[PDB]
Structures are given as C-alpha cells and as structure tokens.
C-alpha cells in the first residue's frame, strides 16, 4: 500500500561613480 | 444467383433485416415509380444478386407506390466494456415492407392524392419473397366509393388487411386493452383448470 517501496561576488564590486 | 452485378442506382434499394430488395426504378422526379418486371434480392450489404420468390401476380406496367416499413425496435442494454460505453442501444429491425399504390398513380403533391389500399405489395425479409396482400373491404360502396373515408387496418404480423370506414377507428388504448384482456383471460382459465371444482364453477 502506502508503505510499498519506502513510501557573494558582485557585491562590494560596483561602479564608484 | 445471377452471373452479373446490377447497377444499383437504376433500382429502388429496400433494406430489411435479412435481405436487400431491389426493384427497377424508372426515372421520375418523385422517385416513387416502380418497375416490378425486374427484381432482385441480396443478403444484406452484399452485391451477389438472385431472383426473389414471387407469390402473386406482379404489375406489368409502371405504378406509383408509397413505401412504409413494418417491424420492431430492438432496445438493448449492451455490456459496458470501454469507458463511456452507452447504457442502451436502440435499433430498428424491419421484417416487412409495404408498397401501397397511389390511386390512379397520382403524385403526392396532387390535391386529389389518395392511397389505393386495394393494391398493396408485401416484401418479407424472412422468406426473401414478394407477394400481394389479400385485402378485405368492409366499407359500403364497392369499387366506386370515396377513398378519402377508408382506413386500412393491418394485424397478425402483417398478414391480415382490412379496409374500414374512418369513423370506425379504434382508440389506441382499446387496441392495447383488447390484446391484454384476451391473453389474460386464457392464462387465468389455464391456471384455474387444475382445480378439481373447475367444471362446476362460473366465470364472472
């Protein structure tokens, strides 16, 4: 039944602008 | 059996339960003219033609006839194999076909159109035969009468034909109840016959 078959880059690297 | 295969568009094709009946069709706009000199009969949906049995003299010249079929409904409940298989199946089984001559060969749209019930031809599926019906006329007037007043009554598996006046028409309830009364009356007496005091008893 139901028991069958076992049931961060790109940050701090931006343009200074 | 005949050696050839006919051209079926020169014939009326009449389909019954056990045969296809072919009668030659002279060209006509209403397609209701019959040439009975050439007729064939075949097993259903087949092109192997043979001469049908003829049990009565057939018309020699062209005649105009109205066709109606005679039979029953086979309403069954077939087994349900596939999903959504139908709960019922309703088919028509035709055992006889009636060909009723138009009086004086008048057309359907003729204002003086009436049927000539004295000349009716019957096709039987069981025997693959064609014959003329024996008709009993009870209307007063003889051969010269108002054909607009007569009614044809068909009974006994399409074997008894009676022409009555339209004022003698039976109610459909009366027809059904007559058959039931006759059958139950005989069955009741058969049931009561084995009682040993039957011979000294009354019906009431």
């Amino acid at each position: 039944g139901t028991g069958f078959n076992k049931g961060d880059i790109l940050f701090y690297h931006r343009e200074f602008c | 059996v005949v050696d050839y295969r006919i051209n079926e568009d020169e014939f009326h094709k009449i389909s019954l339960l056990d045969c296809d009946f072919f009668i030659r069709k002279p060209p006509d706009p209403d397609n209701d003219v019959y040439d009975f000199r050439e007729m064939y009969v075949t097993p259903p949906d087949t092109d192997i033609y043979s001469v049908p049995r003829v049990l009565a003299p057939m018309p020699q010249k062209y005649i105009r006839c109205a066709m109606s079929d005679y039979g029953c409904y086979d309403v069954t409940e077939p087994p349900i194999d596939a999903p959504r298989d139908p709960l019922y199946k309703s088919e028509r089984e035709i055992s006889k076909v009636f060909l009723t001559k138009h009086y004086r060969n008048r057309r359907l749209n003729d204002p003086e159109f009436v049927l000539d019930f004295e000349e009716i031809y019957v096709i039987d599926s069981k025997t693959k035969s064609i014959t003329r019906a024996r008709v009993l006329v009870t209307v007063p007037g003889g051969r010269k009468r108002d054909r607009k007043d007569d009614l044809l009554v068909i009974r006994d598996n399409g074997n008894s034909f009676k022409i009555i006046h339209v004022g003698e028409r039976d109610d459909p309830t009366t027809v059904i109840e007559r058959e039931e009364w006759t059958k139950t009356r005989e069955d009741m007496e058969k049931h009561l016959r084995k009682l040993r005091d039957f011979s000294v008893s009354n019906w009431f």
Binding site: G1, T2, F4, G7 | -
Partner: protein, 114 residues
C-alpha cells in the same frame, strides 16, 4: 483554393440526431462535501498508482503546516487545501480548502442542529 479573400465556411451539412428543479439537490451536494469526492476521482484519473498519490498529498500537506502552522486545524484543513490546490492547478476553480459556512446563523453562540 485562394480566392480574392473569400473562402468556404465549413458546416455540418449533415444531420446529427444527438444534437430544472435540481437547486435543492445541488445545494445539498455542496453542503455534504460530495464535490471534493468527484475532484478526488478526477485527480486519480491522472495518477498511475493511487498509493503514491496518497503519499504525495500527505507530503505536500506536511509542507503546508510547517510553512504556516496557525492557519490549519480549524476551518481550513491542510489536506483539503492540498486537494483544492491540485484541482486549481488543472485550470478549474474551487474554493480554498472547500471551506464553506452557513450564512443564516442567528449570531454567535448558535450551533446548527442536525
């Protein structure tokens, strides 16, 4: 084929012989919950094995309770929410968790009596 554009509309050009007092019954069907019964059978037509369907529904229901604990156990049952969501995923419309209420209740404290 191409004529100028004018074209032949396709029609049946053939005969097909195959071509009101149930309000109380319809409203009772919804009241007793028979609608979900048909939905369950509808979902099981798309399932090869009904035992893995039961397991999958329970697995999805467990996820609902972990995500939002306080919203389930009363008027909204997690298993009913799963079934209604799966019917809506097929493109049909059902109320959320099949939850319905009596609009003719005469105020608080009153229980409908069977």
């Amino acid at each position: 084929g191409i004529q100028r554009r004018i074209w032949r509309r396709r029609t049946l050009t053939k005969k097909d012989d195959m071509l009101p007092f149930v309000e109380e019954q319809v409203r009772k069907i919804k009241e007793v919950g028979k609608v979900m019964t048909m939905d369950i059978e509808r979902l099981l037509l798309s399932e090869d094995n009904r035992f893995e369907f039961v397991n999958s529904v329970a697995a999805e229901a467990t996820e609902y309770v972990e995500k939002n604990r306080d919203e389930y156990g009363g008027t909204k049952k997690a298993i009913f929410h799963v079934l209604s969501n799966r019917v809506n995923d097929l493109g049909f419309d059902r109320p959320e968790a099949y939850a319905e209420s009596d609009p003719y209740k005469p105020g608080p404290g009153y229980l409908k009596e069977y």
